[model samples]
Target chain A: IVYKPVDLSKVTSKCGSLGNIHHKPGGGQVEVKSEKLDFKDRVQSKIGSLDNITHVPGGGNKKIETHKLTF
Target chain B: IVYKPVDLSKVTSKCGSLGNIHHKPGGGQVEVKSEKLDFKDRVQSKIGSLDNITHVPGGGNKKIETHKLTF
Candidate 1:
């Protein structure tokens, strides 16, 4: 299995600024701040899949996790 | 230009665990745990390119940065 990170606009949190996207090989995950928007049209166009999203808050950040997509 | 992440075995950070792979569109970057191995043969076979790798350590983790590859 693989778990990697990327710079994508498809973030789950409402952080709005574009946080981070992680890949699981089996699946993928995205974590963004709690102030971002869904994503820009250009970014959505690039994503291939988005399964589900989860809410993870700790430290001082609200971590939202989403699944990965394809091209 | 685009930055996306994928589920692949190619990672640079030795911390491994396939930490994260970030794409800069013009170029891509991968960060992993400093304790992880280069990658399995299957993953290596999938990569199309490997320009170079960098060491980024902070927040108490050894982070590795690598270029992206295509299948």
Candidate 2:
């Protein structure tokens, strides 16, 4: 359960002199590549997010509320 | 050789749902550790295009065009 800050306004933002885009996807993910770091970091950009809750844990014995992402 | 823009369209695109990815390669690099930023920015995307190619100097007085993602 992760809560991120994506402007939701950059549905079409380009980075570098080329059309490279760098912002949280206003829609979804894009696949390209990162040359210097990893030959593959350029293609697939995505993971997973889930939210903590106010719901009582184990039927209210105890609970934890937090936003988290699993990569 | 520094040209950047990537429009491979995407071998497949999915983010924050699971199976993390950031387009640099469909077969590339992803390390899980950046807790504060994931799923959304969880995966990293990529770069590289042709028009951005300023130069690819390496041959002789024989000039060059592009398509050079060197090591």
Candidate 3:
């Protein structure tokens, strides 16, 4: 099993922000606008079966398996 | 191995945007500002060993194993 790491540097740069600074110490405001990139654990099982499934554009009952699923 | 799913709905809402629209069809501008939340797979091994390790805040060579790694 391969586990991917999260880029701490990029997360800090993108989500961490400082604004409305004041001259006094600890007067500045830190704003974090972070959105989860990964989905919740609960939703993982719901989409797991879709890995090898192939789509029929219009409509069909025949089950087709694609070599690889893109997207 | 548990494979977590990506939030397609949230991805579309966050990264997809339309602006500068015109009366003519296909005249609108689409802007995508996407920052990858997941890190590159290469760095995974470097930090994987840290899972069971404990930090010595000050300065020492004490190998401590925590009950569970947080963050």
Candidate 4:
């Protein structure tokens, strides 16, 4: 099992934010826009505004796609 | 590279549950519960439900704060 926490300042994103917080099996990729990034007892949680990132039409291969936010 | 996946039903949670997940160069934090929060490859994926891992003050300073799940 591997874990990669995201740094919003670096990923340089602004279209809504990253959601869809978990993955199936083969591979897992996610994005988030929040005030904090936390970890405790090994569980990762999101507390603020969130949105799931969807592979936009043409950008899936080049850059980040689209993100739909949630509360 | 780190890959950690979780079970939505288990964590023994309803207010919600957290799992061993990922982080980024600095430190990434996130939370999720759902039919699926997915990961494909090293990117760490969340498919069905996900929220930006945020810290709840007075809360994350210690203890699980308030969580509003996303879908």
Candidate 5:
């Protein structure tokens, strides 16, 4: 099995602020935003915050979509 | 190995909106969004959008930082 490591351990972010959190341990970086508090063990728990659901259209098709907030 | 599934199939999201999406096949639920397009294979491709990088501080040691955009 292949292993992918993520370390938000040393990474800190604030709610509403966007920043790069590390994945693959001390490697692989990407951008992410959170409207939630930055807490230890929070990022790990927030990974799959998105799940199954139907499409909810709004002002525009592009305006309405499923979204998840992770650390 | 542990199996964690994600289903953005019936799920539709906009480039900037936020909502709940599924993980763990038919289980697990979380929120996410994309500034990209509502493409089929796109959401699946957006996971782990955050990888490796350094901390870039600015306005408040939070504004300037690494970030990743996922679908």
Candidate 6:
């Protein structure tokens, strides 16, 4: 079981921001770029499978018969 | 000046994780999904400009002249 799950909405709101720019008279333009880093997506496709097994060991004194347990 | 920059590569490595899955006797199939949140890109184009001004006030000392300060 997983303990915590990540929330994308909260991260986006907090990390998105650019610095302020100001203009001066006689002086050209002052560009104050934000020092914050950009967000990038890193998702990949994955596939896995489980195989069937036979002659499984049984536990307890009583004899029990079971077939095909679905999870 | 802004301090601290976010690194995309580091964040990606830290946030990606999936739990382990175990199969039981006679169990049909078990599927385990990752609990990590997917990364999303959030970038927008922005435009700004500075205008020229005339008759600007000069500051202090002997006659000093300067034009167009670029940052």
Which model scores highest in DockQ?
4
What TM-score do all the candidates reach, one by one? 0.12, 0.12, 0.14, 0.12, 0.13, 0.15
Q: Show model 3 residue runs off by greater than 4 Å.
A: A1-24, A38-71, B1-35, B41-71
Question: For model 1 chain B, where is the 10-residue window of minimal lDDT?
Answer: B43-52
How much is the lDDT of residue B34 in candidate 5? 38
Off by over 4 Å in 2: A1-71, B1-42, B46-51, B61-71
Q: Which is the better candidate, 4 or 6, if ranked by TM-score? A: 6
| Candidates 1 and 4 compared by TM-score, better number | 4
State the interface C-alpha RMSD of candidate 5.
29.1
Of 4 and 5, which scores higher on lDDT? 4
The true-versus-predicted C-alpha distance at residue B34 of model 6, in Å, is 32
True contacts kept of each: 0.04, 0.02, 0.03, 0.07, 0.02, 0.04
DockQ of 2: 0.02
Q: Per-residue lDDT for B1-71 in model 5, tens only?
A: 32233322222222221232321122223235434433322122334422222222221211122323333
Question: What DockQ does each prediction reach against the true complex?
Answer: 0.03, 0.02, 0.03, 0.04, 0.03, 0.02
DockQ of 1: 0.03
What range of 10 consecutive residues in model 4 chain A has the weakest lDDT sum? A8-17
Supply the DockQ value of model 3.
0.03
Candidate 2 CAPRI category: incorrect
CAPRI-style quality class for the chain A–B interface of candidate 1: incorrect
Write the number of the candidate with greater TM-score, choosing between 3 and 4.
3
Q: Which number leads on TM-score?
A: 6
| Model 3 chain B lowest lDDT segment of ten | B9-18
